Structure 1
Amino acid sequence: MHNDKGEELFTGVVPILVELDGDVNGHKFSVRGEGEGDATNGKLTLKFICTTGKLPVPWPTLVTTLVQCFSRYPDHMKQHDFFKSAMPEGYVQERTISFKDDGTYKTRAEVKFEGDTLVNRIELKGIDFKEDGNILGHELEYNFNSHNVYITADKQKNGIKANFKIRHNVEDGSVQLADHYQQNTPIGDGPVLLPDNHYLSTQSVLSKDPNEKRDHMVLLEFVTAAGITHGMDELY
């Protein structure tokens, strides 16, 4: 059913739970988020809170770690949606995020259905960060730019890889690059969809809840797949 069970589990609005256990340079922390995704429109709304007090890193640095199965894949690209096709058993998402002239994150997440909730459970380990870098020094603006996520099928596994560079606005007007390497593997055993080269086009809006005492991030996200044109002449 991997050609169809995918889209079907994501019609309408699906609730989301995110759980992050982080350790950056020995500083442990935890984030919980909840909200909902509308895959048909490629729309996510979530609120994350740091449950261990203050967040030891800027919230923007955690955005990409904190559910690409909610992408809007156009109809002519539906057979390239690996993320949904691995559902409900889900997929493992692993990243290496290298911050230029600073430390690196390594992340391992399981993204899967638990009941009617889409869950993203993550472990994050950061090392080699500078005590007064842009990351541990909290020098990054509280905003987020739009990016493409370039996806390719695994050469030999039934998974995908992705590569992209996040651009973090630094509060002195400069830019902090966060190079992303990404690997996704199905948790289950059945077939999945393996995509042609394509990308996820992603846009994010960060805000704050004015009635929120805890360290927190409110996030609205839009994500749609693009870059494959086969099957489209009739639309013009």
Structure 2
Amino acid sequence: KGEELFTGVVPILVELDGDVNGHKFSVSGEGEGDATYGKLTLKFICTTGKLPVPWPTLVTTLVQCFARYPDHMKQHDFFKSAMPEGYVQERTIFFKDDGNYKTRAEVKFEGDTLVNRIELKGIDFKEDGNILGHKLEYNYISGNVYITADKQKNGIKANFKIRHNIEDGGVQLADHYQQNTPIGDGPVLLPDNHYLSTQSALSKDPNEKRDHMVLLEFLTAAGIT
């Protein structure tokens, strides 16, 4: 039933409040999603001035309900099944040899618009590390989101590793642990193990002088034959 909500282009709003090593900031995002093609187009603006962390570190936090699930896998799409009431998405993201983000989001429809409201807390970051030192490249992120059922919470868990390109040539690893639980009381689709193949392309609006990120992203479910 929630799947019916994604047959066309859906407007998206993202609102994030964050606190990382003593710096509070906010991000607002707007765009649209077309789950038929697993396609997201989003623009994010830091509304408090300059972002105190690199934009690439926020991509995964800033709507997996827009994934393209192949027809033969549609019974494994937890995310859309929870709609319109939505789900809570929580993560801990461990930046190797550095701090961590803990995030909590509610993803739900407000009328015809899919809304992602997030709070983020970052702690134990190194002042001269890759994150607070702004040493990460701005280009591309990709990975496989490995999803498994969480029957006890009528939801899912997921885990994945992001390799953030460092300006010197190296890698900043970000290990993601994820839990999603439905907001509503109704049945959801509890999936077999599978993954979301995700590719995010980061760019800038040449005319935009606010601190911002333009994102073109594709997300496709896979791993069931």
Bin the TM-score by the shorter chain: over 0.9
Q: Map Cα deviations across residues 100-143 of structure 1 (whole Å, 9 max, x no partner).
A: 00000000000000010000000000000000100000000002
Distance of 1:20 and 1:133 partners within structure 2? 23
CA separation in 1, counterparts of 2:118 and 2:153?
A: 22
Q: CA deviation at 1:99?
A: 0.1
Secondary structure of the structure 1 residue equivalent to 2:6: coil
Using the TM superposition, give the Cα deviation of residue 145 of structure 1 relative to its aligned residue in structure 2, in angstroms: 2.8
Report how far residue 80 of structure 1 moved.
0.4
TM-score where L is the length of structure 2: 0.99
C-alpha separation between the residues in 1 aligned to 2:169 and 2:2?
Answer: 42
Deviation at 1:144, TM superposition (A): 2.1
CA distance in 2, matches of 1:145, 1:34: 20
Deviating 4+ runs (over 3 angstroms): none
Conserved 8 A contact 2:151-2:190: no
CA apart distance, 1:223: 0.3
Q: Distance in 1 between matches of 2:47 and 2:3?
A: 33
* Superposed CA offset, 1:56-111 (max 9, x none): 00000000000000000000000100000000000000000000000000000000
CA distance in structure 2 between the aligned counterparts of 1:108 and 1:156, rounded to whole angstroms: 19
Residue 66 (structure 2) pairs with residue 97 (structure 1): no
SS in 2 for 1:211: coil
The percent of aligned pairs where both chains have the same amino acid is: 94
Q: What's 1:79 paired with?
A: 75
SS in 2 for 1:145: strand
1:28-64 per-residue CA deviation (whole Å, 9 max, x = no partner) reads: 0000000000000000000000000000000000000
Inter-partner Cα distance in structure 2 for 1:145 and 1:23: 23
SS at match of 1:8: helix
Corresponding residue SS for 2:151: coil
Question: Equivalences for 1:35-54 in 2 at 5 Å?
Answer: 35-54=31-50
1:181-212 CA distance string (max 9 Å, x none): 00000000011000000000000110000110
Larger radius of gyration: 1
Cα RMSD between the aligned structures?
Answer: 0.6
Contact map agreement 2:3 2:83 (CA 8 A) in 1: no
1:144 match: 140
Shift of 1:6: 2.3
- Distance in 2, Cα, partners of 1:154 & 1:144: 30
Distance 1:50 1:155 in 2: 37
- Aligned pair count reads 225
C-alpha separation between the residues in 1 aligned to 2:113 and 2:141? Answer: 28
In 1, Cα distance between the equivalents of 2:178 and 2:76?
Answer: 17
Deviation of 1:146 after TM superposition, in Å, equals: 1.8
Residue 147 of structure 1, CA deviation:
0.4
Contact 2:126 2:132 in 1 (8 A): yes
Unmatched runs of 5 consecutive residues or more in structure 2: none
Q: What is the Cα deviation at residue 155 of structure 1?
A: 4.5
Quote the offset at 1:24 in angstroms. Answer: 0.2
